[PDB]
Design a protein around this ligand. Structure first.
Ligand SMILES: [Mg+2]
Ligand SMILES: [Mg+2]
Ligand SMILES: [Mg+2]
Ligand SMILES: [Mg+2]
Ligand SMILES: [Mg+2]
Ligand SMILES: [Mg+2]
Ligand SMILES: [Mg+2]
Ligand SMILES: [Mg+2]
Ligand SMILES: [Mg+2]
Ligand SMILES: [Mg+2]
Ligand SMILES: [Mg+2]
Ligand SMILES: [Mg+2]
Ligand SMILES: [Mg+2]
Ligand SMILES: [Mg+2]
Ligand SMILES: [Mg+2]
Ligand SMILES: [Mg+2]
Ligand SMILES: [Mg+2]
Ligand SMILES: [Mg+2]
Ligand SMILES: [Mg+2]
Ligand SMILES: [Mg+2]
Ligand SMILES: [Mg+2]
Ligand SMILES: [Mg+2]
Ligand SMILES: [Mg+2]
Ligand SMILES: [Mg+2]
Ligand SMILES: [Mg+2]
Ligand SMILES: [Mg+2]
Ligand SMILES: [Mg+2]
Ligand SMILES: [Mg+2]
Ligand SMILES: [Mg+2]
Ligand SMILES: [Mg+2]
Ligand SMILES: [Mg+2]
Ligand SMILES: [Mg+2]
Ligand SMILES: [Mg+2]
Ligand SMILES: [Mg+2]
Ligand SMILES: [Mg+2]
Ligand SMILES: [Mg+2]
Ligand SMILES: [Mg+2]
Ligand SMILES: [Mg+2]
Ligand SMILES: [Mg+2]
Ligand SMILES: [Mg+2]
Ligand SMILES: [Mg+2]
Ligand SMILES: [Mg+2]
Ligand SMILES: [Mg+2]
Ligand SMILES: [Mg+2]
Ligand SMILES: [Mg+2]
Ligand SMILES: [Mg+2]
Ligand SMILES: [Mg+2]
Ligand SMILES: [Mg+2]
Ligand SMILES: [Mg+2]
Ligand SMILES: [Mg+2]
Ligand SMILES: [Zn+2]
Lengths: 50, 60, 114
RNA sequence: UGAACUAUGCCUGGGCAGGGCGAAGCCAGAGGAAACUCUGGUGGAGGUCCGUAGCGGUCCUGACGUGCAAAUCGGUCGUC
RNA sequence: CGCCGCAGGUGCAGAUCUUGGUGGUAGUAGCAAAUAUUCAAACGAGAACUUUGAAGGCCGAAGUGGAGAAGGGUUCCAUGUGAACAGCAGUUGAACAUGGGUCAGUCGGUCCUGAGAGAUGGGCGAGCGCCGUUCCGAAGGGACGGGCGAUGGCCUCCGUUGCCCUCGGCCGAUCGAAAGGGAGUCGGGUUCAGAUCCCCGAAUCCGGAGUGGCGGAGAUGGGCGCCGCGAGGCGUCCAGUGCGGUAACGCGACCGAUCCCGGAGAAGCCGGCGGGAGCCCCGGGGAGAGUUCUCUUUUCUUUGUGAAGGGCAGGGCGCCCUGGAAUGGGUUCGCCCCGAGAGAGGGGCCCGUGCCUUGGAAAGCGUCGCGGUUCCGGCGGCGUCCGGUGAGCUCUCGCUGGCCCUUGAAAAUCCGGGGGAGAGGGUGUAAAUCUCGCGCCGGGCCGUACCCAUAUCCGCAGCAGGUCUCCAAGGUGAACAGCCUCUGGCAUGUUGGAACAAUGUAGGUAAGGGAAGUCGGCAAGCCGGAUCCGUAACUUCGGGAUAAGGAUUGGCUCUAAGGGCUGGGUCGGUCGCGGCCGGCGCCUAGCAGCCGACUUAGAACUGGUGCGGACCAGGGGAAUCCGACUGUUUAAUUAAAACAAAGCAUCGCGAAGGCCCGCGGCGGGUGUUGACGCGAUGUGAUUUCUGCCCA
RNA sequence: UGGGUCGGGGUUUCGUACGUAGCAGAGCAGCUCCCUCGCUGCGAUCUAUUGAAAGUCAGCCCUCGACACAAGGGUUUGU
RNA sequence: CGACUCUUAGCGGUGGAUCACUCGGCUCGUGCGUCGAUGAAGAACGCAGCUAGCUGCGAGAAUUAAUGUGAAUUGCAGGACACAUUGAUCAUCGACACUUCGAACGCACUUGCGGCCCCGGGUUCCUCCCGGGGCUACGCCUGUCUGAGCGUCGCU
């Protein structure tokens, strides 16, 4: 809602900041084995815990 | 417009800006951004030009 | 017709969400949130049902910033008791004290016999 | 571990077109020898009636029945 | 890997076996709930679907509109992409990628308590702990007052500190509401996205000020001796914690503590009236548009003044003074009121959201132009006017009623009064003090974007489901009905094209007959609004009842009836073609002028008997059974005759108690209770009865 | 020569169009040097023009009027 | 003549069996056998030039110091780094530091609000506003101070 507490807002901010693609230079590292961020969360598909 | 520590209040922001930029400020408005960083709108006193201050800071 | 919206996040028609229509200089109708209707003091006699005269009817916390004259009447018990019941209390006090003197005189004259 | 659904109590809020009938109380007139009666108004009661919104869910044993839906939809309906 | 030995988690077709993959079905079912699209152009490789324009439609203010709560959490906003996703496509996207965006003393949270939750003391408990919330506590850590002192210093003198005296029950921590209570912010502008928060301009609340910021108030008079021509000054005394009105009460302040009293906060549902506003409607005047085949001085749009002050209307008063009323009077839609003081006259107070005014026209808006700063709060002109109506709608304020075996919070917080402990100065250009005017400083923390739903929430999903609210135009009409339209919105609900077979789903019609169909009139049909008539049995006398039954209804042209405001003067007898008093006259069966809503009744004329022309909108009657009624019920097959109910009857109980909970505590619920009450049963309104049997 | 598309005519359906005019019309509002029974409006409806108007093959009938188009395209086939 | 269907084979798809591999497990054994109010375990939020996860770390934040080592780190960039008036990286780890919750400690939390003592500023000492620092939980032992009792006594 518009009314939210500071803890809820900060939790949402962290979940926002970690919902981004991997940097492209990561895949050039030695022995990477990572292709794409598998922890991507879309707002409509998967809902947050809180 | 500044990005400030989320734990700093308006008085602290005002005093910090005054001390480390040698300017006098009129008021401070404060919000916390959706990414969690605090943003401060610091209006300067009428006898200080925010354009010149931003030029000295180097953010033009 | 131009329809209206609430200007605050309270969306329910509660007793603290009461409005009136205002026409701004911009020729638009907006809501103005009104204050509650105040009440004049009731009399401390607790008998007659009318509310006191000479006193502004405002919300209780507004009385802090009113001057003294606006809150009381220039009389004994002024602003706390009605004039009629003040008159009644004056007469009642005087006459009951007179009756006390009567019984005092009566026993003083009756004690003359052993 | 659960009363975010539901059941019940409590607290604090919000809400319910338009019509019909016409309870007490009241006014006047008329008839009577009286007792009293009759008549016309006024009034606006009620777990009152018709009927929206709301709430419910009668029948079609209608639709659908690998559905729009793990109970929904249409008309007709109960209360309002 | 062979051979000799050794050791096994050692051999699969099955177990509706486990996991993974793949077929036929099958290019099949299907992409059919809510009326609907079309033309041109642009961009583009590509257009039924994107964008612009034009047209035709829909939602039709109880919206497919504009905003919120909860929930979501970046979906918001730009730019770009065209992998996958958006069950067709896409140049589009709530997708993907990159950036950006939420600004507060006065909007909330925060504070208060509510139902309740919950520590401590105590009690229990093997124990984690749990019971309990004033109960079995030494539960006040505070206070202007006074004293004892340290003088800490601008040691004059008042603020400081320690101790003592006196006073001191929220008698219970703490938590509990983004809808309860709760001081104080509005107008204009501004963005791609934020604004009651930014900017501009106007306010306002609370808090503070020790050295006291300025004023004003307190408060500056009276007597006597004098001086002095007098005025005006001098000196000794004396007052002085304001003043007015008969009153209601008023004035700009108007000393005062502990303590006590009271008020406000602080109250339900419903009815009927009245005031105010916004909206709607009517008549003109402007400005801009539309029509002009013909007519229409026409039709549409538009035509402001916030908060906070001041004044004045208007509304209300169970407020005062005079006076004393029956031949009772006043008065409401209803009522109701009066020797406990009517009517009448004169005042007082409250609310004042209305009008005028400061704000304020400088802004805003509409128009007509001229300059540009690639995208100026540009410049300029003109205007922003005058009226009328009302059972109209919606808010609001008030008055007066009704209902209740129902009586409809609490606490923060603020204020008034009673009392008078004290304080302040010796007549000074004075003191204590001041709720008066102005001035100075400050108001931290968190939330704030967007969606709020036939696509941003929950239902596995862009799911016909569910999900709390506020605003609410014109016509018809009884109407927030249905139907059409304006503002605003949309693209037909996850595809299009071509046909028009059966069978379906939804909707109609049907000659003659009229339930012969069927378990059964299921389904459909009939009736339907309003006006005028007229209505039975039965009945608990209230009902039945819209019983039943009959007539009428259009259009046009009139006619009557139903109102409100003003003015009713006989005269130059004179001069403030006008005014102070009087010889000077009889509307007293009331007129004269103007203005304005609908509604009713009657009549004529008229149409191919059609007229509640769509929409809205009861089929009716005679009985039997059951349940009295209204109410409730098996969410997802049973709405009933079942449950409930009032009424009736019985039982237990006087608190060391009845009934009940509890592992436990003399723990807890009924119980903030007390036999007209609690608890436990049966039957089920009314009426009428309720027989016999205690083996 | 052809079949189309318009047009025309026929058939048929409904029922008498718009406009104009009338000393038609219940009446009503204005003008009376006017008028001598008059003149200007509003007025449902009526009468004439007018068995008119409109539709009619899209799966009706006949045209010999007008207009343009019609040796054209593609895929196959042998005892 | 072809289609279609079936069988077989070549090739190509779909699929991921088999085999080979193995910085993982499972089992046994050994030696130690160590948390915490000096604030644990656990949780939250942050921290990199480009960094989402994992890992590491704590506002000194993919780490400081110190010691050992001895020329790298690396995906890109950048700049170091005389390797002796000392040094990249890594390892070790004894110095320093270590945000917020949490036994979690001023009171309370899905929010927020205090009190006391110092220091600095606006004040221009007097107490208001701002900032900084230190305290302010419960139980309990020893001692200390202040006390209470018509508890038991002494003296007056
Ligand atoms: Mg969802
Ligand atoms: Mg803020
Ligand atoms: Mg106004
Ligand atoms: Mg619930
Ligand atoms: Mg009812
Ligand atoms: Mg009903
Ligand atoms: Mg069925
Ligand atoms: Mg095996
Ligand atoms: Mg097998
Ligand atoms: Mg076998
Ligand atoms: Mg198909
Ligand atoms: Mg289909
Ligand atoms: Mg419509
Ligand atoms: Mg909406
Ligand atoms: Mg698709
Ligand atoms: Mg968007
Ligand atoms: Mg995205
Ligand atoms: Mg106490
Ligand atoms: Mg609280
Ligand atoms: Mg509130
Ligand atoms: Mg917005
Ligand atoms: Mg004005
Ligand atoms: Mg009177
Ligand atoms: Mg102007
Ligand atoms: Mg918003
Ligand atoms: Mg839906
Ligand atoms: Mg789920
Ligand atoms: Mg949809
Ligand atoms: Mg459709
Ligand atoms: Mg479509
Ligand atoms: Mg038939
Ligand atoms: Mg028939
Ligand atoms: Mg039969
Ligand atoms: Mg038969
Ligand atoms: Mg039926
Ligand atoms: Mg009947
Ligand atoms: Mg007629
Ligand atoms: Mg029943
Ligand atoms: Mg019965
Ligand atoms: Mg039910
Ligand atoms: Mg059921
Ligand atoms: Mg059922
Ligand atoms: Mg009975
Ligand atoms: Mg009973
Ligand atoms: Mg017996
Ligand atoms: Mg023809
Ligand atoms: Mg193969
Ligand atoms: Mg080092
Ligand atoms: Mg709270
Ligand atoms: Mg003793
Ligand atoms: Zn009284």
């Amino acid at each position: 809602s518009s009314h939210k507490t500071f803890r809820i807002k900060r939790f949402l901010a962290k979940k926002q900041k970690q919902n981004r693609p991997i940097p492209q230079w990561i895949r050039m590292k030695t022995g990477n084995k990572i292709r794409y961020n598998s922890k991507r969360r879309h707002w409509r598909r998967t809902k947050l815990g809180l | 417009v500044f990005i400030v520590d989320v734990k700093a209040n308006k008085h602290q922001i005002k005093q910090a800006v005054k001390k480390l930029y040698d300017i006098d400020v009129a008021k401070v408005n404060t919000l916390i951004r959706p990414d969690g960083e605090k943003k401060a709108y610091v209006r300067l006193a009428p006898d200080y030009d925010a354009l010149d201050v931003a030029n000295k800071i180097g953010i033009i | 017709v131009q329809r209206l919206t609430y200007r605050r996040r309270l969306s329910y028609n509660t007793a603290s969400n009461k409005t009136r229509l205002s026409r701004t200089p911009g020729n638009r109708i907006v809501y103005l949130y009104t204050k509650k209707v105040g009440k004049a003091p009731k009399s401390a006699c607790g008998v007659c049902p009318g509310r006191l005269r000479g006193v502004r009817a405002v919300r209780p916390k507004v009385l802090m910033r009113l001057s003294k004259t606006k809150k009381h009447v220039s009389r004994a018990y002024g602003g706390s008791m009605c004039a009629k019941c003040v008159r009644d209390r004056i007469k009642r006090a005087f006459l009951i004290e007179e009756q006390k003197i009567v019984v005092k005189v009566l026993k003083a004259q009756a004690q003359s016999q052993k």
